[PDB]
Design a protein around this motif. Structure first.
Motif, mmCIF file in Angstrom:
data_model
loop_
_atom_site.group_PDB
_atom_site.id
_atom_site.type_symbol
_atom_site.label_atom_id
_atom_site.label_comp_id
_atom_site.label_asym_id
_atom_site.label_seq_id
_atom_site.Cartn_x
_atom_site.Cartn_y
_atom_site.Cartn_z
ATOM 1 N N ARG A 156 0.737 -1.460 -0.076
ATOM 2 C CA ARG A 156 -0.502 0.174 -0.058
ATOM 3 C C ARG A 156 0.930 1.256 -0.340
ATOM 4 N NH1 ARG A 156 -3.043 -0.626 5.571
ATOM 5 N NH2 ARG A 156 -1.271 -0.891 6.279
ATOM 6 N N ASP A 212 -10.887 -0.866 11.967
ATOM 7 C CA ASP A 212 -10.162 -0.946 11.546
ATOM 8 C C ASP A 212 -8.691 -1.399 12.088
ATOM 9 O OD1 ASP A 212 -7.724 1.713 11.557
ATOM 10 O OD2 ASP A 212 -8.887 2.747 12.808
ATOM 11 N N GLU A 237 -9.414 -2.067 1.219
ATOM 12 C CA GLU A 237 -9.330 -2.248 2.635
ATOM 13 C C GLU A 237 -10.012 -2.229 3.834
ATOM 14 O OE1 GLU A 237 -5.668 0.835 3.957
ATOM 15 O OE2 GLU A 237 -5.211 1.091 1.837
ATOM 16 N N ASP A 265 -5.800 -1.691 11.242
ATOM 17 C CA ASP A 265 -4.600 -0.676 11.131
ATOM 18 C C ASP A 265 -4.567 -0.412 13.205
ATOM 19 O OD1 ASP A 265 -3.301 -0.901 8.941
ATOM 20 O OD2 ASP A 265 -4.403 0.779 8.226
HETATM 21 MG MG LIG Z 1 -6.267 1.841 8.251
#
Ligand SMILES: [Mg+2]
Ligand code: HEM
Ligand code: HEM
Ligand code: HEM
Ligand code: HEM
Ligand SMILES: [Mg+2]
Ligand SMILES: [O]
Ligand SMILES: [O]
Ligand SMILES: [O]
Ligand SMILES: [O]
Ligand SMILES: [O]
Ligand SMILES: [O]
Lengths: 306, 306, 306, 305, 306, 305
Positions: free
Chosen positions: C121, D182, D247, D184
């Motif tokens: 990414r 989320d 994502e 991450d």
């Molecule tokens: Mg993210």
């Protein structure tokens, strides 16, 4: 081309490891059994095809070789070398013959072990018997995936089988075994991140730690060895958990095959003696070796014709 | 219904039998573990659904019952009764708790045993641990199919689960265990036809011998029992082979469940003490019992509510 | 000596096709990922062996090749060539990298896609992502069996892998992708016999129509090509259904591998531009191409050595 | 009365389809409802016994009043928005739910195709999610998902309407919420910190003991006892879904219960908190983007239309 | 409850149908076999659990009943009734005993048939033996899915098992068998749309044709019957293809079970004699019945107690 | 380089053996079918992958070869040779084409047989059709495991496929078939130990009897052959049970493949005519051959042109 034993086996979820010594006077019984072991493997395995995946790899130790056979010895065959490290010790324990029996079910392993030992009764003394089982996600007793970086296909054949460097014994391999017992209470006291630093891979996802975070005394760092040409020297492993809950025995039975024992021995020296950058392999702070033996596993043709 | 434990399991090819005694002062730890054993079964087993088929049946002995629980006792619960036959003996051995753990693979059994024993460390002493495996065509260590005449479906439910005769304990069962070791050398010296006369069924095809050829001292003849009613008295068995090739241990772990121990005990009396037409069960000439214990396996809800 | 990627995969029932472009400045990140993609395939896949059958084939486009590498280019690598037929059009759409991920389950495909994209990414922009599934008994969305005349074994290797004609790139292959959407309403308005005339095979039994009745504008007639030497020119296809019911998208994701793109391109010319006897492939009257890209899939060792 | 297949075996694929009924589409919808069991057999029979295809059909509160007259299920109402101090559970449109499950996605897709083919022109799609089982019953946060679901008779008693609403016995109430995670942020926590959010161990799925399990863990807040001491239970069949290029990593939540009160109590505890917990910590990594409630009638109710 | 035979079997892909007549003097041998047939089913099947799914349903004809038993007859037991239609005929052929043997593999069926016929040698004369095999997508010899609208679960029990209406025979059922041979050449000359009109369902997707388009003389229309009560009258079928390619024999073995023969007989009347709107079932224009027999299949306990 | 037929098949539990003669004038129809038989194998079998394991091996007899083709003949192709032993006889019966069809299920075998015979209607006359089924533990009708000592891998390729010794026909093989009927009543009258002495292996465990107890007239003793050089001569077998309980037919369909018929024929001579130590193979005292034919199975490329 000479036909190897089934060193390169499919994945199997059960194993029996049997290590015996040959008693005085037992040589001839042993020799008869060696020339029949492939036909016993077929007798027990055929009717459970195709999912049984039963195989038996038979190995012979250095001292036993001289008792059983005359003529040439495999060039790399010697007794397992004890390593007396500053902290950790790799012991050498007696062993003349190895039977590495694998299948998709323990009963096939047991049935073949029964037939082999039935023929050897009175000629051999058992030194070790381990019944191994894989955890369902190819995990070992420490909870990590075990086997990920083994070579496959052509790269595996090249890493494990004797070739033109010792042409009389082409198609054989060298097996090193060590039975390890773990200190699970101590291991479970580490955080997952600390365990990952011991092994060198992520626990849940099995991704290797990057070169800038992987410690030099991690298991993956010390068992990564490069040869003269810059290429990786590889072995083929088929480690199996075993244990007994009542006795608090939680174990890994290590077995590694290689074209020459030198590769395996280099890895063991790095693990137990350490290097300039690493005192010893951190996995040994949670793992104690209680056996150690080296065997040559000849080509299948060698066993038949004798 | 109250909810029974998983006494009536699907066919499973691996088991661990764990028998422990409760040390002085261990009762509170044991009671906490009993109330959590179903949630540990789910924690280990759920993620392996639907193939894992992991279950744990927990049984409590007569003397342990008195130490652990306030009130009424199951009507049929008593210590295993030794049988001192003219030739063969059924011994009674210590056992306060039984964990009968079954699955389609040994690793799940081991993982659940590990979690249970982890919680009981310091409160119990192991007495017996057996790792059982089924042979591939439901055979036992004597080479005969084992399980054929077990009851199924509603007939099984009626033979195994306590009902209105003891309503506070409805949905429980009584388990008898005996670990047997076999004299395989002696057994393999018999012809197949002689072995068939010992068991009462054909070896290869598992067809019962006809009434005019089946000996009165065959296993099937002595373990066939009719009640006052003219009706068959049935138990549910899940016998497991086990052993060790190096020690020449070849074994059958017998476990039988019934709604009252009287059924099981009648069969045992016939086997060990004989009848008018039979001195004893011929299977005992090749099989030695080295343990013997009786347990009550309560309904699941009984254990949850502690 | 050279190890191909897993172009010749067993049958798999799930796939993810991921097509990305490389952003300005992303070349270094991409090169690091290419050298690790085999490692990531093992990390995700090993623990699901042997049933998982996870593989990733990585392909590089013509313009991307010149950004990433210098030195030799594969002889046949060029951008996909748009075909502007009198009625039907094969469009060229952007694509620098292809990840063709296959397994026996979608979760393994998704897990590997997640790890690949996690590393990229910031360096790449997604252009297409399709989640494919096997539909019944190897059928596509038009209800016909899809894959029947693929080559197998030796013939597959010879049709798909670069050899001595381009020895620096031996063991690579060329992949053509096109995403097709179908007009199911129109297709289901045809009788089965009319549909069979479009495809060139029987619908239920998948038997090829005889030479006497197979129309010249059937799919099978137009995609059958013989070379100068009289022999069949073959490709390897692994077309996957995909769709969304709420959007009325019913699709076939076409992917074909060949040792030279000329074979695939000849088939495409015949389909879109026609022959003397056939204006165009009748399947195109029910199928619209919305992407089109060509990639070179290097040998696995080419990627490892970066 | 014969229930729909609310209590399904474990299935590794699902399609969740939520639609609204267009003006004038009521009659087409009623004809389809009376045929949905027949379509389930037609698509599924040839893949028996491994296919395990089933379709549970649910009807929303506003839709019920358009389609039927007379008595309504006692607990049927539109999903209730929760406006917490930090987190919000939104309500989104949905008249019909098709919860399609099987051991393979193709069976799900084939049945969805036949259902939507019959409804073309009468309904408007609002949500379509293709769910897949992820490893060993794990969700996208990497935890085993499903472990404490009720089973057997305890499941029947928790999920099926009975004598408390006798005209609708054999039905159930389904709540759906689509959550995005989320990832991450989640991956920035240590494993031990993640275990404190959920309330169970990650690798072994053993529940944390009562003295270490935090009051704001997911397991703590969704454990509820009724006045009489007994556990109030629901049946969940949460499915991962996503798209790697966007994502998007999600959990599609679906919970069945004999009354929506049980599910709604759990949601209030999660979103609005308790005396000892501001909110469920799982919501610091999870955003609900849909929310709907449906009544899933007994199978014979649908057959007899 | 009484225990029924395994009328409601899981899906099985192989079957043997055996129809025999009882010779002069054969009754005692037959009675002995009936009392053992459940134990033969276990002997042959248990060791192949859990995949084997072997079962045997045993049925007895009207004339045979009176030779074998005295006391009560099942209320609905009578000889199969010939139907002499304007075009098509349902014939009656001799049969005293039916063995409907099912499993996942033909060998298990054969093994059980061997043991049954071994016990009956010299007492019976074979009238029919058919070895049936299901196509891989539950299709029959006509290419249509066969089984789809069978009842399941509670609805099946209620449709198939005798209850309170004939309480001495509760748990039994009535089986009708007819062997049909097909004119495959004629059938294959129809378009798929024409075949769909004969059956009443779509061929590829197995979706029923709507009430508006399904012809009155389609198979599904004529075998849909409502009782006086408004409710559907149901049977349970397990039709099996059979044949021989060398003899050009392509067949369907029909077997239908019901709690009373009147349901099955009404369906046959509709098929062969027609209705107000339909001359006869169009399936009969491609299918000829060459056997026809009716049997009562008693509860399992009735047979055990002889 | 030449692609063999699927002589080396995985283990399959069903088979159809079809033997036909070619009628006068039928040669052209047969030739067209031969050029299509591999595409029919794919049409029926591809959609049943990967479990179906359908294959068809096509063989051609000596007299038929001369009718269909001119030019070179395979060096070893001749009509099956009758053996008139002092007690037992191996008969020769007519057969021009063999179709050896195998799969994991009989329906796939039947589907392919139907397509083949459909194309040959009017050109051939059936001589034999057998529907075979293996028992679940690889046992045959005599109750012994059957297939144990077949060669595998490279040893199988070397034993079965024509090579450089007959280069125009490389990749082919020679098939011998015999249909045997057994006297089961007599066989079941033997004790297990007596049965083991007939076969040469233990019945339950399939372990070979040791050299010093194995009788010289056991099946394993007489079918073990060493060549001039002292190495074992091997064939590949795929014997299938078949029968009918009503007619009291219980059979073994023998099929053996080898790179030259000489190996198979030597084994047959030993079985039927005996050796110095053995009058004949004891298995023949329970087994009668009622067919006998020899075929060449060409490489798949040969048929495609
Ligand atoms: Mg993210
Ligand atoms: C207690 C004993 C052991 C345990 C539990 C263990 C476990 C592991 C684990 C979890 C991995 C990482 C995944 C993989 O298999 O690639 C691994 C890698 C490895 N282990 Fe061990 N191991 C043990 C002993 C040994 C020994 C004694 C040797 C060598 C003599 C060895 C050689 C290797 C090698 C070569 C690798 C691969 C490293 C690489 O190239 O990435 N292991 N081991
Ligand atoms: C050495 C220990 C044992 C072995 C190896 C063994 C083996 C067998 C075998 C092979 C059968 C025939 C197949 C079957 O129905 O399962 C059988 C049946 C049976 N055994 Fe055992 N058994 C043992 C101990 C016992 C004991 C201790 C009991 C009772 C206390 C028992 C009760 C039974 C019963 C009830 C049956 C079925 C009889 C019937 O046909 O109705 N067994 N056993
Ligand atoms: C709408 C897109 C497509 C669909 C639904 C489709 C479908 C099919 C089907 C049903 C077959 C018959 C069975 C078999 O696979 O052998 C087939 C054959 C084939 N298709 Fe396609 N196809 C598509 C696009 C293409 C494209 C774009 C190409 C090549 C550029 C192609 C090349 C082939 C080839 C070579 C064959 C085999 C012909 C032979 O029998 O030798 N297809 N396809
Ligand atoms: C009459 C029916 C036949 C039956 C039931 C039968 C059965 C068997 C069985 C049970 C075995 C032992 C297990 C194995 O390795 O497969 C065997 C082995 C064998 N059979 Fe047969 N057989 C028959 C006919 C034949 C014929 C006709 C031939 C050859 C012309 C033959 C050649 C062989 C060979 C070569 C072996 C392997 C011997 C070795 O090296 O161990 N069989 N057969
Ligand atoms: Mg971007
Ligand atoms: O390792
Ligand atoms: O037993
Ligand atoms: O294609
Ligand atoms: O959940
Ligand atoms: O039917
Ligand atoms: O054989």
């Amino acid at each position: 081309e000479p036909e190897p034993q089934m060193v390169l086996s499919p994945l199997t979820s059960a194993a029996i490891f049997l290590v015996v010594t040959i008693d005085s006077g037992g040589e001839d019984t042993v020799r008869d059994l060696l020339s029949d072991v492939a036909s016993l493997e077929r007798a027990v395995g055929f009717r459970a095809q195709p999912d049984g995946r039963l195989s038996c790899v038979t190995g012979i130790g250095s001292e036993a070789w001289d008792r059983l056979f005359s003529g040439a010895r495999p060039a790399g065959l010697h007794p397992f070398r004890e390593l007396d490290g500053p902290v950790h010790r790799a012991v050498a324990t007696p062993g003349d013959l190895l039977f590495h029996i694998r299948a998709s079910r323990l009963d096939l392993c047991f049935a073949l072990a029964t037939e082999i030992m039935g023929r050897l009764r009175g000629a051999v003394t058992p030194q070790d018997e381990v019944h191994g089982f894989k955890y369902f996600d190819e995990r070992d007793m420490l909870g990590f995936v075990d086997g990920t970086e083994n070579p496959t296909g052509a790269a595996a054949r090249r890493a494990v089988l004797v070739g033109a460097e010792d042409p009389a014994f082409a198609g054989g391999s060298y097996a090193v075994v060590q039975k390890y017992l773990h200190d699970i209470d101590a291991w479970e006291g580490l955080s997952v991140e600390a365990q990952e630093r011991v092994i060198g891979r992520r626990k849940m996802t099995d991704v290797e730690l990057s070169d800038d975070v992987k410690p030099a005394d991690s298991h993956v760092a010390l068992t990564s060895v490069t040869g003269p040409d810059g290429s990786d020297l590889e072995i083929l492993r088929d480690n199996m958990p075993f244990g007994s809950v009542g006795r608090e025995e939680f174990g890994t039975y290590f077995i590694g095959y290689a074209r020459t024992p030198e590769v395996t021995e280099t890895m063991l020296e790095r693990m137990f003696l350490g290097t300039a950058s690493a005192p010893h392999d951190r996995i040994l702070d949670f793992s104690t070796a209680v056996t150690g033996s080296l065997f040559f596993t000849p080509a299948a043709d060698f066993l038949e014709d004798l």
